[PDB]
Amino acid sequence: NLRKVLISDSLDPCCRKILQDGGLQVVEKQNLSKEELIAELQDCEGLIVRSATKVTADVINAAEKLQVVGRAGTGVDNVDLEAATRKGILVMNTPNGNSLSAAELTCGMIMCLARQIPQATASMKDGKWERKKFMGTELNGKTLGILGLGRIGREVATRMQSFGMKTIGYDPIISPEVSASFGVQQLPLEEIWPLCDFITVHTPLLPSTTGLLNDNTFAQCKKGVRVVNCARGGIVDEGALLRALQSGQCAGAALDVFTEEPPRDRALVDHENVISCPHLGASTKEAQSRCGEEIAVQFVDMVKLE
Amino acid sequence: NLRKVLISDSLDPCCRKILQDGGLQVVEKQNLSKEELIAELQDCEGLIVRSATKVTADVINAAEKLQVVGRAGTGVDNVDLEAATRKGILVMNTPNGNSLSAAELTCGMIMCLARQIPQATASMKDGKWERKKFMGTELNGKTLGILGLGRIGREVATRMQSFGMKTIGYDPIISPEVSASFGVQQLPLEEIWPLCDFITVHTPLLPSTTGLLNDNTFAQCKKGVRVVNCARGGIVDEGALLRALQSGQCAGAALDVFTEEPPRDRALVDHENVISCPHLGASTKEAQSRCGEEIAVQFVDMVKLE
Numbered sequence: 001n002l003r004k005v006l007i008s009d010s011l012d013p014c015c016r017k018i019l020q021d022g023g024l025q026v027v028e029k030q031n032l033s034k035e036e037l038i039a040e041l042q043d044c045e046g047l048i049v050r051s052a053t054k055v056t057a058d059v060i061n062a063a064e065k066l067q068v069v070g071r072a073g074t075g076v077d078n079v080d081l082e083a084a085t086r087k088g089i090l091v092m093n094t095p096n097g098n099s100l101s102a103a104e105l106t107c108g109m110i111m112c113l114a115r116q117i118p119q120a121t122a123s124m125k126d127g128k129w130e131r132k133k134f135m136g137t138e139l140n141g142k143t144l145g146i147l148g149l150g151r152i153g154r155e156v157a158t159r160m161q162s163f164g165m166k167t168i169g170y171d172p173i174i175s176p177e178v179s180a181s182f183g184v185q186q187l188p189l190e191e192i193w194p195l196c197d198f199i200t201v202h203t204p205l206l207p208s209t210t211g212l213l214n215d216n217t218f219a220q221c222k223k224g225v226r227v228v229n230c231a232r233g234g235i236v237d238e239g240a241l242l243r244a245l246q247s248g249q250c251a252g253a254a255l256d257v258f259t260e261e262p263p264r265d266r267a268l269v270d271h272e273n274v275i276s277c278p279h280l281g282a283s284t285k286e287a288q289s290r291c292g293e294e295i296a297v298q299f300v301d302m303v304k305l306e
Numbered sequence: 307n308l309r310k311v312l313i314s315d316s317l318d319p320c321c322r323k324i325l326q327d328g329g330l331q332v333v334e335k336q337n338l339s340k341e342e343l344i345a346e347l348q349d350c351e352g353l354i355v356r357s358a359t360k361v362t363a364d365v366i367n368a369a370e371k372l373q374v375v376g377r378a379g380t381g382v383d384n385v386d387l388e389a390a391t392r393k394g395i396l397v398m399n400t401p402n403g404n405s406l407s408a409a410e411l412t413c414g415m416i417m418c419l420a421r422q423i424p425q426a427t428a429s430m431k432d433g434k435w436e437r438k439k440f441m442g443t444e445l446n447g448k449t450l451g452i453l454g455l456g457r458i459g460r461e462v463a464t465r466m467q468s469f470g471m472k473t474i475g476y477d478p479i480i481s482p483e484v485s486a487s488f489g490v491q492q493l494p495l496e497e498i499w500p501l502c503d504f505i506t507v508h509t510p511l512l513p514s515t516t517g518l519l520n521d522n523t524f525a526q527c528k529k530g531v532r533v534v535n536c537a538r539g540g541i542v543d544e545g546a547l548l549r550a551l552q553s554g555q556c557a558g559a560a561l562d563v564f565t566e567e568p569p570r571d572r573a574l575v576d577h578e579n580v581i582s583c584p585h586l587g588a589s590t591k592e593a594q595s596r597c598g599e600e601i602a603v604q605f606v607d608m609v610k611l612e
């Protein structure tokens with residue numbers, strides 16, 4: 001079954017502990033070269049990654065004993081699913097562990113857009129006292145549009161309801177009855193755009209969600225709409241977002257994620273009305289601990305099957 | 307016996323409208339000199355200010371007909387209360403207009419301390435991608451200590467309850483039964499300090515609250531406590547806070563307010579774990595509008611009482 005598991009990224013110690021409690025041998029090495037990674041995998045049936053380690057077609061094809069790739073996080077962004085499927089390698093992730101940490105960062109970004117706290121801190125640290133520049137907006141009575149009403153979307157909804165925000169949204173798979181149970185009125189996208197003071201995206205990256213916000217959608221928005229992307233780079237068209245920030249059609253944007261990470265185009269990051277993080281949505285001690293446990297349990301469950 | 311009211315700062319047109327609906331005469335002039343202000347007040351029993359106009363002892367002593375000074379805001383920093391009291395002039399403020407805007411900024415500051423959003427934005431704008439540096443804290447299950455359970459304290463409590471924070475606190479006049487009704491468990495200060503992951507202050511500035519947080523209180527705190535002051539400068543002893551940040555007893559602080567504004571001592575503002583705003587707690591379009599209305603209504607209520 002599984003003898004040895006490699007951990008190629010920085011995880012909570014509890015990942016290794018649960019695996020070793022399950023009778024598995026564990027190696028833990030970070031910042032390994034592509035050649036280095038291939039070398040340490042020759043003894044291993046299991047590999048556990050975060051987002052740093054790139055499990056490409058070349059790494060999969062070279063790792064002969066590899067049976068399972070485990071990602072302590074959501075999606076499979078840094079894993080070639082096609083390459084793994086062709087080799088019969090099982091790819092597992094932790095869809096629940098990061099939900100609350102991503103929802104909390106999203107809520108923080110909404111508050112930061114309303115009051116420009118990051119820009120105000122930068123101003124203060126430059127020895128400036130700029131009261132007029134940083135006149136902000138009250139969230140109470142404003143409309144938040146939530147695109148994607150899965151794990152994270154519903155947690156954002158209930159938190160921002162406590163601020164007196166009206167929460168509307170769209171999800172092609174979630175019933176209006178389910179969304180109603182967490183206070184989100186579902187509408188067609190065309191009805192959402194004109195109502196929103198704030199828009200936040202919580203969808204996978206799919207053809208249908210690539211530029212879910214674009215020039216066509218910004219044209220339908222309230223002048224001065226504020227937008228959050230703590231989901232995946234590209235869901236908000238970065239070209240369309242910059243054009244909306246330049247016109248003032250968009251009053252501000254908060255971006256945890258970019259089409260390229262780190263972004264080589266700095267136009268959005270450098271914009272005075274853009275707040276950003278280097279993909280910190282899952283970067284809490286609690287989320288890293290829960291994902292480490294979630295992936296370790298999946299590995300042990302595989303042992304029980306084998 | 308209010309007949310004529312001067313507005314010496316920039317207010318929403320709704321302030322003048324409510325006053326004129328109440329049968330009062332209104333004059334509206336901004337950026338007036340101290341001599342100029344005294345000249346325009348000779349006909350006026352009422353003066354309405356923001357923060358720009360300085361209602362000093364000299365202006366009060368010179369204004370013969372002046373009976374009431376109204377501030378469209380919570381503080382009265384720019385009014386000499388002693389000088390006004392000696393003359394029998396009533397000083398009025400707007401204790402309700404700013405509550406939600408101050409509560410929202412406080413909640414934003416808590417989220418910013420949990421995930422270092424201002425520092426992460428500064429890092430991104432410096433061309434850096436520092437994922438590991440900005441490992442943060444999940445708010446769910448953490449304890450928030452709220453000192454002052456009046457208008458703002460109770461609004462902070464219900465919002466942060468939606469994040470799954472345990473809300474404890476202290477208020478010398480609010481009964482434990484009343485605080486329980488908005489989800490805040492009242493304990494003696496000595497029992498609060500060791501439990502808190504986060505502490506926020508929502509008290510007036512009094513002798514009893516000057517250094518409410520100090521070396522004695524930080525010594526009783528959990529190592530790595532995070533502190534918010536969106537109330538008044540000096541409630542958190544700035545010397546004691548800097549010492550706690552330097553030792554790591556305090557993992558971070560968010561300051562909207564300072565003992566001197568703008569602060570001449572930059573040690574706190576410049577600290578990597580300190581986020582700050584130039585006193586933006588009441589700086590929303592909605593709060594500024596509501597305070598302008600709230601002060602006008604108080605003037606009209608006085609007219610109705612005579």
Ligand SMILES: NC(=O)c1ccc[n+]([C@@H]2O[C@H](COP(=O)([O-])OP(=O)(O)OC[C@H]3O[C@@H](n4cnc5c(N)ncnc54)[C@H](O)[C@@H]3O)[C@@H](O)[C@H]2O)c1
Pocket residue numbers: 074075095098099102147148149150151152153170171172173174202203204205206208209230231232256257279280281282283
């Ligand atoms: N920033 C971070 O560090 C971080 C961490 C966790 C998750 N995420 C990302 O956040 C996103 C949401 O994660 P989740 O756990 O809530 O996922 P989920 O699968 O629980 O929910 C996603 C929802 O999006 C809906 N959806 C699909 N296409 C849509 C469309 N065209 N319009 C609207 N909704 C659509 C789906 O029906 C589903 O309900 C994902 O992209 C995930 O990878 C980012």
Ligand SMILES: NC(=O)c1ccc[n+]([C@@H]2O[C@H](COP(=O)([O-])OP(=O)(O)OC[C@H]3O[C@@H](n4cnc5c(N)ncnc54)[C@H](O)[C@@H]3O)[C@@H](O)[C@H]2O)c1
Pocket residue numbers: 380381401404405408453454455456457458459476477478479480508509510511512514515518536537538562563585586587588589
């Ligand atoms: N940052 C800003 O721009 C901004 C804007 C609005 C208000 N404020 C400030 O926020 C503070 C709170 O305002 P509010 O409207 O909630 O006031 P409030 O009068 O409604 O409530 C203050 C509470 O503090 C309590 N208190 C007094 N001494 C205390 C002590 N030793 N320990 C604990 N609690 C004590 C009082 O009993 C009272 O219930 C004030 O200092 C106000 O000036 C700041």
Ligand SMILES: *C[C@H]1C(=O)[C@]23[C@H](O)[C@H]1CC[C@H]2[C@@]12CO[C@]3(O)[C@@H](O)[C@@H]1C(C)(C)CC[C@@H]2O
Pocket residue numbers: 319320323324327599
């Ligand atoms: C501009 C203000 C104003 O004149 C209002 C409000 O304070 C604000 C908008 C709406 C006005 C009222 C409510 O209170 C007012 O002070 C008053 O002028 C208006 C009355 C006549 C009381 C009722 C209609 C309107 O809602």
Ligand SMILES: [Cl-]
Pocket residue numbers: none
């Ligand atoms: Cl509720």
Ligand SMILES: [Cl-]
Pocket residue numbers: 478479480481482
């Ligand atoms: Cl009591």
Ligand code: NA
Pocket residue numbers: 072073097098282283284287288289291
């Ligand atoms: Na994680």
